[PDB]
């Protein structure tokens, strides 16, 4: 839980001033004002949509979700209103496969990649009982969303250091890319789909493109293979005084 990249080599996460404004009885929040407001809305538009580059006649259909956001200052309700939009399903649901839609919900709303096939198949268990709105509100009303983001900050890609699986850090680095990278470049076709269902890992050059500036992006590759052989049984011996002991 130290995480040597997070507030050192990246920026600080954006969001509202505090969460004590909800208990204030003459206001609802520290009132930001329309220069301090819309530059936070620029960071929700760059995160829920990727870099989708939404036009002026596509933002006009999102007029109602901002007008509620500048009165009720909850960030989580703004993210929930933008994921049930037409502009979220015409980019990430309409021409994609099912695990491509699921792997972008982990990117846009959690900042991580899915850790399992069992965690991934339970999101298709919620598709059968309520469609795509049952997937979206179960991510938003989860415990993992509450104890990382809450109502206060935008859901950002967080370098944690103490990931519950090491593979979770790998699939986060494939999902986000560089800053000149959107998420329409594959023709559908989930990137993490082979590695979730089989149990293997990712490619080292695809992860090191998305690492920050100043973190040895790519070195360490020996010129032999990049993954491990599960069938190999090596002999690793320890020197004692007399000989060499192969505690296998």
């Amino acid at each position: 839980a130290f995480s040597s990249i997070q507030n050192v080599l990246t920026d600080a996460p954006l969001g509202t001033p505090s969460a004590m404004g909800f208990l204030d009885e003459r206001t609802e929040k520290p009132l930001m004002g329309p220069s301090e407001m819309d530059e936070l809305v620029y960071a929700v538009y760059k995160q829920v949509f990727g870099n989708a580059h939404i036009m002026e006649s596509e933002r006009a259909e999102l007029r109602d979700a901002e007008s509620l956001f500048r009165y009720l200052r909850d960030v989580r309700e703004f993210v929930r209103a933008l994921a049930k939009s037409n502009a979220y399903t015409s980019r990430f649901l309409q021409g994609n496969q099912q695990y491509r839609f699921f792997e972008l919900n982990f990117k846009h709303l959690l900042g991580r990649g899915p850790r399992s096939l069992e965690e991934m198949a339970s999101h298709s268990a919620l598709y059968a009982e309520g469609g795509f709105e049952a997937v979206i509100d179960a991510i938003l009303d989860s415990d993992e969303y509450a104890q990382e983001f809450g109502s206060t900050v935008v859901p950002y890609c967080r370098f944690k250091g103490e990931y519950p699986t090491n593979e979770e850090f790998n699939r986060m680095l494939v999902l986000k890319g560089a800053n000149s990278t959107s998420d329409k470049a594959g023709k559908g076709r989930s990137k993490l789909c082979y590695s979730i269902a089989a149990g293997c890992s990712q490619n080292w050059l695809s992860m090191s493109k998305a690492l920050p500036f100043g973190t040895e992006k790519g070195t360490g590759f020996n010129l032999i293979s990049s993954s491990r052989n599960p069938a190999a049984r090596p002999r690793i011996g320890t020197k004692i005084p007399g000989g060499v002991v192969f505690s296998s």
């Binding site: 996460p13 969001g15 505090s18 969460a19 004590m20 909800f22 909850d74 989580r76 309700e77 509450a146 104890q147 990382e148 983001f149 809450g150 109502s151 206060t152 900050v153």
Partner: peptide, 20 residues
């Protein structure tokens, strides 16, 4: 920046339950 003693939609509830 999350400040653990905090909620999101029971905060919606009790302002429309103390009036009730």
């Amino acid at each position: 920046r999350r400040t653990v003693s905090f909620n999101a939609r029971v905060a919606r509830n009790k302002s429309q339950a103390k009036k009730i």
